[PDB]
Design a protein around this ligand. Structure first.
Ligand SMILES: OC[C@@H]1CCCN(c2ncnc3[nH]c4cc(F)ccc4c23)C1
Length: 167
């Protein structure tokens, strides 16, 4: 039993809710919140800008030190950093950005990072400003992630379409 509330169950291990991931993180304080990161960990907008703003820019300060030491992530890759006031840990995952021309096949590699964590609160990778089809992202999530994932979808209209079209 865990503290996630109001989710629709899609499969054995995938759950979905129309929610603001920032507000959901503030309430649940999950072990892991996933960020929709880019390779530079520049958290300017989308999910990343919102999560970083909620940490009062502490996420960005930590991220800048990470990049100065380690260099950029790979598209499809991830790193574990602090969750600050939102979660124990933040898993920064880089899905392909279609608006940069990145290969959508890398979306499966991106979701594989979730399997290193037993339970996660996450957004749909490569959705939103990353330019992928969120229906496709949900399908890849369900077919790739085997650990327990609680998906927060900010847009109510999109949430209803994702549920209604789910096979
Ligand atoms: O849904 C399409 C976009 C892009 C893909 C996923 N994004 C989110 N997903 C879950 N929670 C979210 N809180 C947010 C707060 C913001 F200021 C911006 C985006 C989100 C956000 C929204």
């Amino acid at each position: 039993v865990n503290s996630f509330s109001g989710y629709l169950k899609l499969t054995d291990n995938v759950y979905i809710k129309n929610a603001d991931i920032v507000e959901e993180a503030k309430k649940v304080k999950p072990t892991v919140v996933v960020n929709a990161a880019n390779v530079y960990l520049k958290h300017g907008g989308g999910v990343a800008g919102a999560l970083n703003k909620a940490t009062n820019n502490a996420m960005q300060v930590e991220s800048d030190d990470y990049i100065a030491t380690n260099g950029p992530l790979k598209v499809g890759g991830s790193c574990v950093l602090s969750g600050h006031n939102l979660a124990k840990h933040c898993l920064h995952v880089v899905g392909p950005n279609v608006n940069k021309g990145e290969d959508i096949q890398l979306l499966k590699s991106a979701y594989e990072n979730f399997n290193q964590h037993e339970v996660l609160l996450a957004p749909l990778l490569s959705a939103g400003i990353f330019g992928a089809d969120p229906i496709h992202s949900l399908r890849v999530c369900v077919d790739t992630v085997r650990t327990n994932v609680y998906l927060a979808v900010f847009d109510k209209n999109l949430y209803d379409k994702l549920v209604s079209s789910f096979l």
